[PDB]
Structures are given as structure tokens and as C-alpha cells.
UniProtKB/Swiss-Prot annotation:
Protein name: Receptor-interacting serine/threonine-protein kinase 1
GO biological process: amyloid fibril formation; apoptotic process; canonical NF-kappaB signal transduction; cellular response to growth factor stimulus; cellular response to hydrogen peroxide; cellular response to tumor necrosis factor; extrinsic apoptotic signaling pathway; inflammatory response
Entire-sequence positions represented here: 8 to 294 of 671
Recorded domain comment: The RIP homotypic interaction motif (RHIM) mediates interaction with the RHIM motif of RIPK1. Both motifs form a hetero-amyloid serpentine fold, stabilized by hydrophobic packing and featuring an unusual Cys-Ser ladder of alternating Ser (from RIPK1) and Cys (from RIPK3). The death domain mediates dimerization and activation of its kinase activity during necroptosis and apoptosis. It engages other DD-containing proteins as well as a central (intermediate) region important for NF-kB activation and RHIM-dependent signaling.
Start and end residues of each Protein kinase domain: 10-267
Active site per the UniProt annotation: D131 (proton acceptor)
Gene name of the encoded protein: RIPK1
Outcome reported for the amino acid change (mutating S18D): Phophomimetic mutant. Significant loss of kinase activity
Gene Ontology CC entries for this record: cytoplasm; cytosol; death-inducing signaling complex; endosome membrane; mitochondrion; plasma membrane; protein-containing complex; receptor complex
Cystine crosslinks: none
UniProt disease annotation: Immunodeficiency 57 with autoinflammation: An autosomal recessive primary immunodeficiency characterized by lymphopenia and recurrent viral, bacterial, and fungal infections. Patients exhibit early-onset inflammatory bowel disease involving the upper and lower gastrointestinal tract, and develop progressive polyarthritis.
Length: 272
């Protein structure tokens, strides 16, 4: 039963650097300090959808795990709706991959394992992210990650809010399963997230994103990320996982608990 916060609780007289965070920005809280601000709606009122929203939030508040970012609270105000979540100092996954330094096999692989525990946890709670991608992986100072849903994809009501025409406030297709490409009617499954996971493993070892009509149809046909562009050393059973998880058949792809069952043994020994 979620924490409500107010707009007044924050300060703008501060120059925060929300660089490398994405759509969401950084906010300074007067009592508690640095936080992540997702503004989702601004404009006219509509206290007619408030209750539903709350219920949704209540439901999503049941998701609590070390690899999913925490909601610190919501701002539900007249003509203004926001989500407020924990601060992750290093920002999203791409930003850290596209850093000016470098990151070890042991780190990258631990990042992967952490992701996996996240996703397995989520599916454990019978929930489909529907939008897994490096943008929605956030990193703390100790390169421990947390999964986010910053485009509200896995939401229903809050989703419906972030698009209400009366609002005043896509590449994401490169991570989408092909089943869902040009077919909006097929119900997403855990597997859709697994395809997405695959393309993320690619993004990680490639330290960069992947690459419409032609391309979309190509991916539907069987096109995948150019596995040649990984100039970094990437293990055989890992490019094997990548290959297996972006299979055109949802039947062919593995569950996260299975993936981990086979990967947890493989991280600790040959990676950490
Ligand atoms: C509004 O009530 C709520 C109540 C609880 C939460 C949120 C919003 C959140 N919102 N979040 C966002 O990233 C929103 O941009 C975070 C979040 C959302 C979904 C996640 O997994 C998904 F989407 F199921 F696939 C996740 F790992 C983290 C955060 C979770 C906790």
C-alpha cells in the first residue's frame, strides 16, 4: 500500500545531472536526497482514474526483490502524476557499457546473472516485463544492477495514463520478439522477455545497440544481431545461450529458472 509523496518535497534550485539515465530525470528530495523521477502525466485533472491507479500500484508493490528497482513513492496530484524510485548512481546499462573505461568478464557475467535472478523473480510472480532492454537495466556504484520499466510497458492503467491524448508530457523494436512484430494481437509470454534477454546479451558483449519495413520483415524472416561485431572475447556457451534464446520458436526458448539452473554453475567457476 504505497507511499504518497508531494511535489513540494523536492527542490529544483539544484543542478542535477540526469545524463545517462534516459527518459527519467534526477530529483533532489528535501529530506532523503537523490532520487529518480518519472513524470508520467501532466495537464488537466482526472480523479476518475485515481482509484484504479492506486490498485495497480498496490499490485505492483508486491514485486520486491534485489534486482528490481524500488518505488519510493508516487506523486498523485491535480493534473500531475509521477513515480519516484531509488537512485542508481551509474545510470542505465548502455551508458555503463559505453563508458570511457572498461569492464571485465566477471562483471559482465555477474550483471547477466543478476538480470536472470530479476527476470526469474518476475516470472515467479507471474508477470511479463514486455520491454526488456539496456535502457531498463540500471546500475549502482558497485555494478550491481536493477531492472526497471521506464516506458511503463508492463503496466495497464499507468500505461493508459502515459498516453492519454490529453497529456502534456521505436528502437524498442530491436528487442521485441518477432511474433510481436507487426502482430499486436498475440499475448506476450515469458518467452517474449527471453528473446529480449538474448538481444541484451548481444548488446552487452557488443558494448552497443543493434543496427523499418525491410528490417522488421527481415527479423520476422529470421534476421538477428550481427554476431560478428563482438570484438570482445565472448564464451562459447554464452553465444550458445544467445543463439538459443532468440529462436524463432517460443517453444524452442528456455525459461529463466532453467537458464539460471545452467548459468549459476557456469558463472562462479569460469567467470568470477
Ligand atoms: C506505480 O506503482 C508502482 C509500484 C511498484 C513498483 C513501480 C510502480 C515501479 N515502476 N518501475 C518503473 O520502472 C516504472 O518506470 C519499477 C519497475 C517496474 C516494473 C518492473 O518489472 C516489470 F515491469 F514487471 F517488468 C521492474 F523491475 C521495476 C518500479 C517497480 C515497483
Amino acid at each position: 500500500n504505497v507511499i504518497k509523496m508531494k511535489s513540494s518535497d523536492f527542490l529544483e534550485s539544484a543542478e542535477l545531472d540526469s545524463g545517462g539515465f534516459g527518459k527519467v530525470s534526477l530529483a533532489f528530495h528535501r529530506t532523503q536526497g537523490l532520487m529518480i523521477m518519472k513524470t508520467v502525466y501532466k495537464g488537466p485533472n482526472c480523479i476518475e482514474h485515481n482509484e484504479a491507479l492506486l490498485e495497480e500500484a498496490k499490485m505492483m508493490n508486491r514485486l520486491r526483490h534485489s534486482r528490481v528497482v524500488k518505488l519510493l513513492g508516487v506523486i498523485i496530484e491535480e493534473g500531475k502524476y509521477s513515480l519516484v524510485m531509488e537512485y542508481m548512481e551509474k545510470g542505465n546499462l548502455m551508458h555503463v557499457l559505453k563508458a570511457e573505461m572498461s569492464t571485465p568478464l566477471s562483471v559482465k557475467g555477474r550483471i547477466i546473472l543478476e538480470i536472470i535472478e530479476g527476470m526469474a523473480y518476475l516470472h515467479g510472480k507471474g508477470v511479463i516485463h514486455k520491454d526488456l532492454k539496456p535502457e531498463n537495466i540500471l546500475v549502482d556504484n558497485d555494478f550491481h544492477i536493477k531492472i526497471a520499466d521506464l516506458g511503463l510497458a508492463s503496466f495497464k492503467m499507468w500505461s493508459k495514463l502515459n498516453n492519454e491524448e490529453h497529456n502534456e508530457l521505436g528502437g524498442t523494436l530491436y528487442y521485441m520478439a518477432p511474433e510481436h512484430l507487426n502482430d499486436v494481437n498475440a499475448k506476450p509470454t515469458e518467452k517474449s522477455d527471453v528473446y529480449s534477454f538474448a538481444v541484451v546479451l548481444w548488446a552487452i558483449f557488443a558494448n552497443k545497440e543493434p543496427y523499418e519495413q525491410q528490417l522488421i520483415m527481415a527479423i520476422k524472416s529470421g534476421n538477428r544481431p550481427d554476431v560478428d561485431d563482438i570484438t570482445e572475447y565472448c564464451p562459447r556457451e554464452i553465444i550458445s545461450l544467445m543463439k538459443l534464446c532468440w529462436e524463432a520458436n517460443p517453444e524452442a526458448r528456455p525459461t529463466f529458472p532453467g537458464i539460471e539452473e545452467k548459468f549459476r554453475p557456469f558463472y562462479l567457476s569460469q567467470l568470477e
